[PDB]
Amino acid sequence: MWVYRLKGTLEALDPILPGLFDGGARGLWEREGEVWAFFPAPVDLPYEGVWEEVGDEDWLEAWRRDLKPALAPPFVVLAPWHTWEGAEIPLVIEPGHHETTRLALKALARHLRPGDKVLDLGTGSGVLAIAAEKLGGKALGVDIDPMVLPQAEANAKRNGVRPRFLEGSLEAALPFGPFDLLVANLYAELHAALAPRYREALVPGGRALLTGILKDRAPLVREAMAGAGFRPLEEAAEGEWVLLAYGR
Numbered sequence: 554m555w556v557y558r559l560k561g562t563l564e565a566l567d568p569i570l571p572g573l574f575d576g577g578a579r580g581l582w583e584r585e586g587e588v589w590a591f592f593p594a595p596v597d598l599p600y601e602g603v604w605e606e607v608g609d610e611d612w613l614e615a616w617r618r619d620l621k622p623a624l625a626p627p628f629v630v631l632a633p634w635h636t637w638e639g640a641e642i643p644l645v646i647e648p649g650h651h652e653t654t655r656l657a658l659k660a661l662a663r664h665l666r667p668g669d670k671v672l673d674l675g676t677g678s679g680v681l682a683i684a685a686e687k688l689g690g691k692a693l694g695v696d697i698d699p700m701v702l703p704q705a706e707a708n709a710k711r712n713g714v715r716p717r718f719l720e721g722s723l724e725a726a727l728p729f730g731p732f733d734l735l736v737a738n739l740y741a742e743l744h745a746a747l748a749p750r751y752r753e754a755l756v757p758g759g760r761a762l763l764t765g766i767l768k769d770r771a772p773l774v775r776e777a778m779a780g781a782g783f784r785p786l787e788e789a790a791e792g793e794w795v796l797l798a799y800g801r
């Protein structure tokens with residue numbers, strides 16, 4: 554579809570809205586002092602607006618503008634353009650929308666202590682590693698996808714913290730361990746296969762916070778973790794998602 558952009562507010566353009574609808578507009582939106590009228594394709598209109606075809610980037614921008622802060626006690630996840638006047642610890646992330654990220658942030662605040670060394674396995678946007686530094690920990694975020702590293706680095710900087718970010722997985726992290734705590738938002742079968750190496754990555758008394766787990770698959774993780782010598786400490790869920798916390 555195409556947009557016809559006009560300078561002005563809906564209130565000011567009121568006189569010509571009927572004409573835009575007669576001309577076939579199916580949608581209208583006031584967007585920062587401009588009225589955008591949406592059509593299947595350009596048609597002849599006397600209003601002196603400008604036609605432009607709508608693309609995926611326009612959809613992304615519109616969606617972005619509709620984003621609001623997301624609470625994840627003790628944190629609040631904010632888009633770089635959000636302002637927040639609450640008590641919550643801010644976590645600025647270039648567009649924390651998932652249940653699992655939320656479970657992970659709340660669990661992290663409980664199990665992480667100032668001065669703890671943290672491994673955020675499958676760091677992605679770097680949100681967990683960033684929250685760990687904000688809580689007084691020292692974190693390493695690793696991801697097998699090199700492409701996420703630059704955005705993670707940039708989110709860190711926006712948050713005034715500096716975790717270490719590295720391409721790779723668990724084996725790549727070992728030289729920097731052992732760690733006091735590992736947080737891994739992955740999926741149940743992967744946790745199950747890594748259980749033995751999770752034990753190796755942590756110091757005695759260390760903690761493993763596992764999420765990205767569907768309720769129907771929780772059994773797999775309980776079994777592999779018990780099998781690996783971990784003791785369960787806490788469980789929490791949101792929707793169909795579960796976080797399981799263990800001590801080594």
Ligand SMILES: Nc1ncnc2c1ncn2[C@@H]1O[C@H](C[C@@H](N)CC[C@H](N)C(=O)O)[C@@H](O)[C@H]1O
Pocket residue numbers: 649653654657673674675676677678679680681695696697698701721722723738739765
């Ligand atoms: N085996 C693996 N080792 C390291 N990273 C992985 C592995 N498998 C998947 N990943 C990354 O794990 C991340 C999973 C994300 N859902 C987690 C992002 C972030 N930690 C969060 O809680 O929101 C993705 O960025 C994957 O690229």
